[PDB]
Amino acid sequence: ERPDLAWLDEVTMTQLERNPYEVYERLRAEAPLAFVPVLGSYVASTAEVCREVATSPDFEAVITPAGGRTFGHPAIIGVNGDIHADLRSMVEPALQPAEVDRWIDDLVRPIARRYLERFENDGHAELVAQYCEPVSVRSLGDLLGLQEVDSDKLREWFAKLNRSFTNAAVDENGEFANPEGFAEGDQAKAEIRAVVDPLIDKWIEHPDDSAISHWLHDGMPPGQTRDREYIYPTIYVYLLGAMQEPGHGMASTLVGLFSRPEQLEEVVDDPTLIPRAIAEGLRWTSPIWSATARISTKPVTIAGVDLPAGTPVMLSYGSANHDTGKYEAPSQYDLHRPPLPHLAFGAGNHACAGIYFANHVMRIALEELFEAIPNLERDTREGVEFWGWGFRGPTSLHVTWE
Ligand code: HEM
Numbered sequence: 001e002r003p004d005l006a007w008l009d010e011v012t013m014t015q016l017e018r019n020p021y022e023v024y025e026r027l028r029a030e031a032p033l034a035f036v037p038v039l040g041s042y043v044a045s046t047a048e049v050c051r052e053v054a055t056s057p058d059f060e061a062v063i064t065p066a067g068g069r070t071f072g073h074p075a076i077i078g079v080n081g082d083i084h085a086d087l088r089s090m091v092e093p094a095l096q097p098a099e100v101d102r103w104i105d106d107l108v109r110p111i112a113r114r115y116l117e118r119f120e121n122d123g124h125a126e127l128v129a130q131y132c133e134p135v136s137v138r139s140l141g142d143l144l145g146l147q148e149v150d151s152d153k154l155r156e157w158f159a160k161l162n163r164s165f166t167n168a169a170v171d172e173n174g175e176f177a178n179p180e181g182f183a184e185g186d187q188a189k190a191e192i193r194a195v196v197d198p199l200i201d202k203w204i205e206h207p208d209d210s211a212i213s214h215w216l217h218d219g220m221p222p223g224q225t226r227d228r229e230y231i232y233p234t235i236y237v238y239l240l241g242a243m244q245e246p247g248h249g250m251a252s253t254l255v256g257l258f259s260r261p262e263q264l265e266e267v268v269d270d271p272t273l274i275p276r277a278i279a280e281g282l283r284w285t286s287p288i289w290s291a292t293a294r295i296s297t298k299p300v301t302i303a304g305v306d307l308p309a310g311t312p313v314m315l316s317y318g319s320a321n322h323d324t325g326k327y328e329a330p331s332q333y334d335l336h337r338p339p340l341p342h343l344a345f346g347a348g349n350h351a352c353a354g355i356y357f358a359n360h361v362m363r364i365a366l367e368e369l370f371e372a373i374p375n376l377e378r379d380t381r382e383g384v385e386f387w388g389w390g391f392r393g394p395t396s397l398h399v400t401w402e
């Protein structure tokens, strides 16, 4: 118990979900590594500390308590050594840049057009549900082999898994404050199994181009497949973050550009600026804000704190990307910010494996949107509300045109 941080005792989970920025602005100044009682964990809040923990030889991957309750073992994000190496070898082939470039265009662009065609002549839309999330899940779902799971269902799954994974509040004793908050996630996993089990049955006997078929078969001895219980936790990882984050990234990018109308106009007139707009969007509101963690494997001193071996540290990358030691006025979206390293994809050997793919999905989606609707205007009838501490993004993005 750190005396000068006694105010952290009164920080609530709801506060952090609704708006973590004021608390984390204090943390970055007072204690870049600090134990947050309601989270039951140390959290790293600055760019220097997050990067150090994520790349340190004295830390390894771990899942948070709520995250482990949600995904089980072996979730690619929470394992190390030979298991992690196998899971990385499993997912990396379809994410290799040279491979992505072979097909990303023909994958994403027809999908973006299909969802645009449903509303581009309406003069109003809610872009999160009508465009950003559907493009994100349909693109990845087709790649995975889930062509027959409609986008409504994929979006419901990642929303349920998100809430379950981020169900992190703990009581004074150290147990979960909402032990009922995992039930929704359990139901999503059961629905996922009902859909994927027969697909796995088929792929074992009849492999095809779908990523999950390749997860079963790639690198295995002849006639063998990875056991479904061995790959399911990484399937869940995909059906949460991989499904959710590209849509949140493009939506937050749009919110940011709306907040700088001159910059929105710039990007519409010159869509070669879209990659830069997206990189700034991810820094400005990081889709994975504080979901992942590491655990120390030996005593280590971090930000003046002597940590024993076995100490978990939550990586609040969304706070690190507002580090005022790194950025000028980081709370503002600025397309013309000098390109600088950011931590929205994490760091170290557990950094995002899908960066190149994710950036193209978001790029192609915004290219088609601005081409279809050059005169997008935000519905200023209300402000944009963001939600989430673990994962963060706009809950809706109402716009008009014409
Ligand atoms: C813009 C959207 C995305 C963002 C912001 C993003 C950000 C991340 C972050 C922060 C992590 C954790 C890194 C750490 O703890 O240091 C991550 C891990 C990962 N992401 Fe991405 N991700 C994104 C889209 C994807 C997509 C679409 C895929 C799959 C196609 C993907 C596959 C991964 C995988 C497999 C891991 C686990 C890597 C490991 O633990 O070894 N991500 N992502």
Ligand SMILES: COc1cccc(OC)c1O
Pocket: 067, 077, 165, 236, 237, 238, 239, 240, 241, 242, 288, 291, 292
């Ligand atoms: C906490 O859950 C996650 C963390 C990082 C990446 C994920 O999906 C790729 C993901 O589902």
